[PDB]
């Protein structure tokens, strides 16, 4: 997260860290046994880390649970990042509490102008690299589809939305991948891609979760 703020320990209780010996992606806990992340975060041997603030210090509220199954969206296109969404089933159900909690799926899509919370342990610099150990937060509006398509001609599908600031300086970044965009208490986005980070006229592009609720629900019901 570039230009964000320190969330505060466990203030984003649905935020997960995907760990393969190191943090490599974020995710969102959507029920006690399922995590949603980005398909471009797919790899084998994922441990899901819940209740994290400092990902380098055991602080007392963590739950470390291995993934038993990962399901990349059937139409994920890694070249275009269309349908950049994946489900991860935990080997055992997480213990839900005030600091580890699921985030609700949307019943409707959020409109441009809605303010959302984006969070992650990604890079905090737009040039160079500095990775924080504690969770960073960014409040950002959803941008209109027209401004989104104008920033990224030919690259925005109906399964994507832009959020952020056309003036730059505030954005998600590498390592925030797969993490949540939460608007009015609902998971509306997944950190997916962007041109660099926090660059002028290059807002973040997010997977449009409301388009996948039926797939998510059907998949969880049968797996
Ligand atoms: Ca920790």
């Amino acid at each position: 997260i570039v230009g964000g703020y320190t969330c505060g320990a466990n203030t984003v209780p649905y935020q997960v860290s995907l760990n393969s010996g190191y943090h490599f992606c974020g995710g969102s806990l959507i029920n006690s046994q399922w995590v949603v992340s980005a398909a471009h975060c797919y790899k084998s041997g994922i441990q899901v880390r819940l209740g994290e603030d400092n990902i380098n210090v055991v602080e007392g509220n963590e739950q470390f649970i291995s993934a038993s199954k990962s399901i990349v969206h059937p139409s994920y296109n890694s070249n275009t990042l269309n349908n950049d969404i994946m489900l991860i089933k935990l080997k055992s159900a997480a213990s839900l509490n005030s600091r580890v909690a699921s985030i609700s799926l949307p019943t409707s899509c959020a409109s441009a102008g809605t303010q959302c919370l984006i969070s992650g342990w990604g890079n905090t610099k737009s040039s160079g690299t500095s990775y924080p150990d504690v969770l960073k937060c960014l409040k950002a509006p959803i941008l209109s589809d027209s401004s989104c398509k104008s920033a990224y001609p030919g690259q925005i599908t109906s399964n994507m939305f832009c959020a952020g600031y056309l003036e730059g300086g505030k954005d998600s970044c590498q390592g925030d991948s797969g993490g949540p965009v939460v608007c009015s208490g609902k998971l509306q986005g997944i950190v997916s891609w962007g041109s660099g980070c926090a660059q002028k006229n290059k807002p973040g592009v997010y997977t449009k979760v409301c388009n996948y609720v039926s797939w998510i629900k059907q998949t969880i019901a049968s797996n």
Side-chain angles (χ1 to χ4, degrees):
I1 302 286
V2 179
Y5 60 101
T6 298
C7 302
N10 309 116
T11 59
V12 190
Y14 50 82
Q15 171 86 45
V16 310
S17 166
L18 303 182
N19 183 286
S20 57
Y22 49 85
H23 167 85
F24 69 90
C25 271
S28 303
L29 188 68
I30 58 172
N31 64 32
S32 66
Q33 255 196 312
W34 286 91
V35 167
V36 74
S37 183
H40 80 262
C41 292
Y42 165 78
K43 63 168 73 176
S44 49
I46 296 182
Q47 189 186 61
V48 174
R49 299 197 158 199
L50 313 171
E52 288 279 22
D53 189 47
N54 189 319
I55 49 173
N56 278 325
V57 180
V58 178
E59 294 176 296
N61 297 292
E62 296 89 350
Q63 302 176 43
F64 298 164
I65 308 178
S66 291
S68 62
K69 181 190 283 188
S70 298
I71 303 168
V72 171
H73 190 275
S75 295
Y76 172 58
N77 183 326
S78 62
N79 292 324
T80 63
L81 296 178
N82 196 28
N83 305 296
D84 191 11
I85 184 165
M86 160 189 72
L87 288 170
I88 300 165
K89 188 183 189 180
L90 305 182
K91 280 201 326 86
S92 60
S95 187
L96 300 180
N97 56 51
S98 62
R99 300 180 165 81
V100 178
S102 54
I103 184 66
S104 292
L105 289 171
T107 54
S108 55
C109 304
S111 301
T114 302
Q115 195 204 49
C116 308
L117 180 66
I118 308 166
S119 49
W121 289 277
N123 197 1
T124 61
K125 298 305 190 187
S126 50
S127 291
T129 55
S130 176
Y131 284 78
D133 300 324
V134 294
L135 189 64
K136 297 279 149 165
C137 273
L138 177 64
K139 291 178 175 189
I142 295 175
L143 303 174
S144 65
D145 292 320
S146 73
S147 69
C148 191
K149 292 184 159 98
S150 298
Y152 296 103
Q155 303 156 250
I156 303 303
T157 72
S158 59
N159 300 311
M160 299 171 188
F161 65 90
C162 286
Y165 299 90
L166 290 180
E167 53 273 36
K170 296 187 219 78
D171 196 4
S172 54
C173 200
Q174 213 257 12
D176 295 319
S177 283
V181 182
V182 166
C183 325
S184 312
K186 311 286 185 183
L187 182 71
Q188 291 284 0
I190 299 169
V191 181
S192 183
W193 61 277
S195 190
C197 302
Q199 301 293 308
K200 186 177 297 183
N201 291 321
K202 293 292 174 176
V205 186
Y206 298 91
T207 307
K208 192 174 181 168
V209 173
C210 60
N211 287 359
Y212 299 97
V213 169
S214 294
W215 173 74
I216 291 171
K217 290 182 172 183
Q218 299 179 9
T219 298
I220 289 176
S222 305
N223 286 276

